[PDB]
Amino acid sequence: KARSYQIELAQPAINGKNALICAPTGSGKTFVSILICEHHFQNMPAGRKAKVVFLATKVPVYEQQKNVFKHHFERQGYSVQGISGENFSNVSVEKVIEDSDIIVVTPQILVNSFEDGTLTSLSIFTLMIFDQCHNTTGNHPYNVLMTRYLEQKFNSASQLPQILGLTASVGVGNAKNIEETIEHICSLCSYLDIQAISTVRENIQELQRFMNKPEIDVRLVKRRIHNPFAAIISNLMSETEALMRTIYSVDTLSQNSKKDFGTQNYEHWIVVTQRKCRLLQLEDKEEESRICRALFICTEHLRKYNDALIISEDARIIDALSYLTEFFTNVKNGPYTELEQHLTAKFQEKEPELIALSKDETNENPKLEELVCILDDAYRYNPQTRTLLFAKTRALVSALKKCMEENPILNYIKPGVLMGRTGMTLPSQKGVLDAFKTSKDNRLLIATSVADEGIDIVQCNLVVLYEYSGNVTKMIQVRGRGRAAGSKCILVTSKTEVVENEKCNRYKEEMMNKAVEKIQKWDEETFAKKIHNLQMKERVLRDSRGQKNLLCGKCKAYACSTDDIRIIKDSHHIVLGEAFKERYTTKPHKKPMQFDGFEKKSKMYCRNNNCQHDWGITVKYLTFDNLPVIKIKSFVMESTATGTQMDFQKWKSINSSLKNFDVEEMSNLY
RNA sequence: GUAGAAACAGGGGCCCUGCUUUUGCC
Numbered sequence: 001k002a003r004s005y006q007i008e009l010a011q012p013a014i015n016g017k018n019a020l021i022c023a024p025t026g027s028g029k030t031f032v033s034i035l036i037c038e039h040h041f042q043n044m045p046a047g048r049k050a051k052v053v054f055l056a057t058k059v060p061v062y063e064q065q066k067n068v069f070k071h072h073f074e075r076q077g078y079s080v081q082g083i084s085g086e087n088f089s090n091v092s093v094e095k096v097i098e099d100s101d102i103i104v105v106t107p108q109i110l111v112n113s114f115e116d117g118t119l120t121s122l123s124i125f126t127l128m129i130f131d132q133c134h135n136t137t138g139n140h141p142y143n144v145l146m147t148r149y150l151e152q153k154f155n156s157a158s159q160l161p162q163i164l165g166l167t168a169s170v171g172v173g174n175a176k177n178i179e180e181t182i183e184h185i186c187s188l189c190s191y192l193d194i195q196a197i198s199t200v201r202e203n204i205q206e207l208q209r210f211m212n213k214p215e216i217d218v219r220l221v222k223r224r225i226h227n228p229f230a231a232i233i234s235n236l237m238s239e240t241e242a243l244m245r246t247i248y249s250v251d252t253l254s255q256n257s258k259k260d261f262g263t264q265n266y267e268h269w270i271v272v273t274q275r276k277c278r279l280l281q282l283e284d285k286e287e288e289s290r291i292c293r294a295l296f297i298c299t300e301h302l303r304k305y306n307d308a309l310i311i312s313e314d315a316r317i318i319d320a321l322s323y324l325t326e327f328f329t330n331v332k333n334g335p336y337t338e339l340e341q342h343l344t345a346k347f348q349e350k351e352p353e354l355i356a357l358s359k360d361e362t363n364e365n366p367k368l369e370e371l372v373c374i375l376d377d378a379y380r381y382n383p384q385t386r387t388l389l390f391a392k393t394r395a396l397v398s399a400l401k402k403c404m405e406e407n408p409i410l411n412y413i414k415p416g417v418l419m420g421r422t423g424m425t426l427p428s429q430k431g432v433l434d435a436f437k438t439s440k441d442n443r444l445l446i447a448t449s450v451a452d453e454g455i456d457i458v459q460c461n462l463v464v465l466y467e468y469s470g471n472v473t474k475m476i477q478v479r480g481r482g483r484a485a486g487s488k489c490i491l492v493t494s495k496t497e498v499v500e501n502e503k504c505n506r507y508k509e510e511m512m513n514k515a516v517e518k519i520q521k522w523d524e525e526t527f528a529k530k531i532h533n534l535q536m537k538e539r540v541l542r543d544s545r546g547q548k549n550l551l552c553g554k555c556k557a558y559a560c561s562t563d564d565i566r567i568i569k570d571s572h573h574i575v576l577g578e579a580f581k582e583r584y585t586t587k588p589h590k591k592p593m594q595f596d597g598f599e600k601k602s603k604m605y606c607r608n609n610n611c612q613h614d615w616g617i618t619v620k621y622l623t624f625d626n627l628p629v630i631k632i633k634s635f636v637m638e639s640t641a642t643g644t645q646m647d648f649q650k651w652k653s654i655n656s657s658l659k660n661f662d663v664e665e666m667s668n669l670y
Numbered sequence: 671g672u673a674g675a676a677a678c679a680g681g682g683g684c685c686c687u688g689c690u691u692u693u694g695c696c
């Protein structure tokens with residue numbers, strides 16, 4: 001049965017308009033899309049049949065919505081099917097579309113199907129529903145599809161499906177006022193060819209009875225007064241930078257650092273330095289290799305020190321020390337050249353003091369104590385509480401898991417951990433969430449942004465954001481995880497910037513809502529004209545728009561020529577010939593699974609034992625075993641014409657100049 | 671293989687460009 005705000009929201013789309021539905025998370029936007037579907041099905045003109053596609057950005061959501069529509073519509077005699085990457089391969093997409101009244105998909109499935117010629121026109125659909133439609137932007141699959149929709153609209157020799165978009169936040173982009181916010185929202189509208197924005201105006205009070213927007217609480221807590229740990233590590237980082245200058249004048253390559261150790265700014269300095277160092281070209285190739293490798297290692301070490309600093313700010317000294325000791329264990333197990341031995345020793349020199357510092361309990365993190373106090377208060381007051389605790393990085397989430405494991409809240413509450421996809425698998429993720437839902441003692445969940453939206457999580461009465469800031473849409477989603485009766489959302493930070501950030505988000509949320517009500521004042525003509533002008537602008541922006549050797553990204557040793565490379569299925573870059581087999585060595589893949597028609601066999605590495613750089617994998621494919629598949633990020637390209645060296649993060653530039661795989665060519669190579 | 675977001679800063683005169691962090695998708 002429908003609520004009145006649900007009926008209200010469905011009205012423009014029921015009248016056949018391309019509609020954008022803005023309504024709060026969990027308010028029942030999906031139920032609204034179902035009401036529109038029902039109406040769609042019944043009001044088809046003579047001789048027409050409906051074909052609905054529901055698009056979802058993620059597999060969990062894909063699965064949830066698939067089963068919603070199955071349950072709602074199969075009992076009414078409708079055929080409801082779904083395609084995701086998990087079955088894309090074993091089904092014909094054309095056939096599924098042919099046999100189905102409603103099809104639910106992840107959007108890339110459709111993109112793949114246009115690109116491979118399976119589909120030619122979007123006229124096969126009468127209604128396209130885009131869950132989380134605010135993702136229609138840039139090179140997102142949603143926007144690839146809507147670009148195709150608009151290209152067809154512009155060669156208007158066909159009828160196009162109705163568009164429906166579901167979101168809880170249209171966003172504001174870079175808007176600083178109502179006017180620029182209005183521009184941003186209209187842009188989104190133009191990308192989706194919207195004709196009406198549908199919000200709750202008439203039935204606001206009923207909405208407010210079902211939805212309870214948590215009271216936020218923003219707490220600024222004090223940092224450590226002294227951080228001896230960070231003094232030490234910083235000196236090591238200074239030592240390491242000076243050693244780096246000894247090796248090669250990085251002043252002639254990159255700039256000198258501002259020694260702002262343990263900052264994002266430093267993090268990005270090291271990253272820029274790395275790319276410059278690896279693009280070093282010398283006459284003497286032996287020296288190029290020697291220098292580049294030693295700078296590779298130095299920058300790697302500098303990054304880990306920086307990481308350890310940042311970890312120590314948000315967590316315990318021991319968590320930061322653990323991170324480094326695990327790293328150095330790996331150093332000791334790798335090539336472990338003389339330079340790596342030197343660095344490990346300089347560290348082990350200082351390690352006794354660090355172990356000492358990490359054991360002092362007056363050397364404890366104020367911000368982490370405050371976190372623990374917050375949790376203790378909640379579970380003391382209400383032991384039924386279920387908490388969702390968010391933090392930015394995997395390293396921080398791991399640290400917080402260890403904390404809450406070794407120091408359980410009120411000495412009984414146990415944490416679960418949720419990270420993205422060692423990551424976690426979707427089965428693992430689901431396992432964790434089920435425990436978090438049902439368990440008596442597992443009432444705390446620690447998560448990265450994996451938990452912001454989409455995947456189904458039991459409602460929480462406490463949401464804690466631990467130095468976890470972001471944009472207005474993130475804020476809106478994250479609060480939607482806290483809708484249990486008398487829920488709180490608490491932002492814990494030691495940074496005024498983050499407090500101001502959250503102050504801005506409040507402004508923008510209210511700016512956004514005001515911007516929408518102004519747009520809703522306009523008549524259809526005014527709106528339609530505006531959206532059209534932007535589609536025309538977008539269109540005019542689109543109007544405007546040799547042989548190389550690959551070198552080990554680390555030791556600069558010759559790998560292969562671009563002439564030896566073949567592309568399989570536009571994605572996978574294999575290397576032909578016996579010569580290349582001399583250049584690498586393999587180890588069994590630790591996860592030897594199958595995907596895209598390929599079976600993973602091995603990891604590939606630079607054969608240079610002093611390097612051992614990861615180059616990719618080997619696979620079984622068709623009638624071929626142990627095909628090497630290289631990844632672009634492991635290599636530096638060098639032009640055979642100019643001699644000059646290039647870095648590339650994506651194949652996209654190069655692919656134009658590479659031959660495609662030919663099973664007949666391959667067959668002759670034996 | 672590749673997409674979004676956020677942070678950090680090289681180019682154009684507010685977009686472009688990269689980078690990491692993070693999540694995703696095939």
Ligand SMILES: *O[C@H]1[C@@H](O)[C@H](n2cnc3c(=O)[nH]c(N)nc32)O[C@@H]1COP(=O)(O)OP(=O)(O)OP(=O)(O)O
Pocket residue numbers: 571572573596600615616617629630631632671696
């Ligand atoms: O360049 C990649 C790519 O060609 C192929 N590949 C690996 N993972 C994926 C994937 O999720 N999706 C697609 N389309 N293609 C993929 O293998 C090449 C090498 O990649 P990696 O070296 O990262 O391979 P793998 O993930 O097995 O290494 P690791 O995860 O064990 O580090």
Ligand SMILES: Nc1ncnc2c1ncn2[C@@H]1O[C@H](COP(=O)(O)OP(=O)(O)O)[C@@H](O)[C@H]1O
Pocket residue numbers: 001002003006023024025026027028029030031032
């Ligand atoms: N009118 C209704 N009657 C009963 N349950 C409803 C109703 N509207 C929504 N729900 C329930 O609310 C939950 C959230 O709805 P959903 O459409 O997923 O929200 P949204 O897409 O707006 O985030 C679902 O479990 C759904 O069954």
Ligand SMILES: [Cl-]
Pocket residue numbers: 607608609
């Ligand atoms: Cl070698």
Ligand SMILES: [Mg+2]
Pocket residue numbers: none
């Ligand atoms: Mg990989």
Ligand SMILES: [Zn+2]
Pocket residue numbers: 552553554555556557606607608611612613
């Ligand atoms: Zn190498």
